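Chapter summary example: a protein plus Dodecyldimethylphosphine oxide.
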Amino acid sequence: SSVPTKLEVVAATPTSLLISWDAGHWWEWVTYYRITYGETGGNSPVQEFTVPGYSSTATISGLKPGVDYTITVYAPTSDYGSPISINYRT
Amino acid sequence: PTKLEVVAATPTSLLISWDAGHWWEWVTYYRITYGETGGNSPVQEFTVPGYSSTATISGLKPGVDYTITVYAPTSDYGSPISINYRT
Amino acid sequence: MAWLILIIAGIFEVVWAIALKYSNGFTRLIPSMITLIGMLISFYLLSQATKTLPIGTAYAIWTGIGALGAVICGIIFFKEPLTALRIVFMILLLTGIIGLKATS
Amino acid sequence: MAWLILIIAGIFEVVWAIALKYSNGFTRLIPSMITLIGMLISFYLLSQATKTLPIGTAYAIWTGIGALGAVICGIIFFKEPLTALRIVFMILLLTGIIGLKATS
Ligand SMILES: CCCCCCCCCCCCP(C)(C)=O
Ligand SMILES: N=C(N)Nc1ccccc1
């Protein structure tokens, strides 16, 4: 894709993950990112929130310890890039 | 504006209210300022949208006589409204 | 049909124009509110009228009615001047405007 | 002074116009902020100008400078076709604007 880039967990806790990305160059900076997280299986839905586009990090709280999750960062549109996801067990 | 009352007060905060007018007189913002009636130093101030006719003043020292004034955007309306009030 | 909502996009252009004059530097609530709301009506009405129509002929007539409506409602409501000279340079300005927008 | 403000309002009129195309669905941060900042500056300056100037002359001149900057920028920064029609429309526009300032 183009943005976002390099989605990693900076810090983690049994219940909470702190994730970060490379927004890219100034001209690639978007107005917001929408961030999805749920059990990497999907017992019912997923959980979702958005973050102002000027932020490269987001904290995800209220997870079940021991469980593998999938965490996806989207751009406003599909014009920019494919939505980069990672798996992480808490 | 007109009719600057203190609808409610606690030792540390006042709820003030005024008469916006009607229709043609409504201004887009009011600018309220409050300070000790005495040694003052500066005055704290803030602004409220002109559709709102109440305001809350918080973080007052209990027992101290404060003076509250409500400005229109410009002079050309109906002058500032001022009151004194001990908390 | 998109032509008529382009006309109306253009009338609402004059509406916020006059409402903005009435707001006295955007300090009188209601004329201030009309100015804002009557704007995004104009812009919305446009983007729909423009969907169908040429962008060039759209804007040309949009801003034409905007600019002339302001000039006319002005000399009327705010008893703004009506000089032989002013009516002329306004005509050269609106045709230059209409002109350049009708070229793009 | 009121006139000087109008010129800068017209200047910011085009800077948000061109920044809005360089924003996507209002999605690119930096162009989105520029459009947003250029509109709030454009409107503000216009609203303050309209206090001392006829709405008819304020609107038309504002719109004009935006239309003129749009083509001056269009021609220079986008290789846009420079017609003899386009030049005479920019001359009528300038004559319109200069003219109106001269009957103050
Ligand atoms: C929505 C954008 C325009 C914002 C302008 C706010 C209106 C009030 C302008 C007052 C400041 C200038 P003053 C003290 C000479 O009236
Ligand atoms: N609607 C317009 N003609 N112009 C405009 C430009 C900038 C801010 C708000 C509105």
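Key point: The interface with chain C takes residues 43-44, 46-48, 50-51, 54-61, 63-64, 67-68, 70-71, 74, 80, 83, 85-86, 88-100, 102-103 of chain D (CB under 8 Å).
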